[PDB]
Structure formats: structure tokens, C-alpha cells
Amino acid sequence: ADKISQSETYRRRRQEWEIQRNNAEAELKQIDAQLKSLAVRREAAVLQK
Amino acid sequence: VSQLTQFGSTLQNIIERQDAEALNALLQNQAAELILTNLSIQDKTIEEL
């Protein structure tokens, strides 16, 4: 039973690494669109110049 | 001579008027040219949103 409980522990840990990896991927993905918005804001600032 | 002085005063009034009206037309053509860049800025602000 202790071998089984160790196995279920390693599995739960791996699922928590899915929660963390997906959170990191989503934050990475949202940063690129933030950069796109800033690229626009800068094009409009060159145009104000 | 007094008739000539009267033509000279009319002539000065004409000169002042025509020069001011050429400035009036210059400021309108200049603001007509200034408006286009503001339109471009507003359009790129939409893309920012």
C-alpha cells in the first residue's frame, strides 16, 4: 500500500506540473499580444511626431 | 492733388485688405492639410484597442 501511495503521489505531482506549465504558456502567449499593442502605440507616436 | 490723396488712401486700404484675405485663405488650406494626420492617428488608436 505504501508503494501504491507513492505512485499516486508522483502522478498528482505530474498533474500539478500541467497546471504550472499551462499557466506559464498562457502568460507567455499574452505577452506577445501586449508587444503587438505597444508596436501600434509606437507607430501612432511616430505619426504624432 | 487732394483727389490724388484720396486715391492713395483707397489704394492703401485695398492693399491691407487683400493681404489679410490671402492670409485667411492660407490658414484654411493649412488646417485642411493638418487634419489628415489626426485622422490617421485616430484610426491607429482603434487598432490599438
UniProtKB/TrEMBL annotation, chain A:
Residues 7-49 form a coiled coil. This is TcdA1. It comes from Photorhabdus luminescens (Xenorhabdus luminescens). The lineage of its organism: Bacteria, Pseudomonadati, Pseudomonadota, Gammaproteobacteria, Enterobacterales.
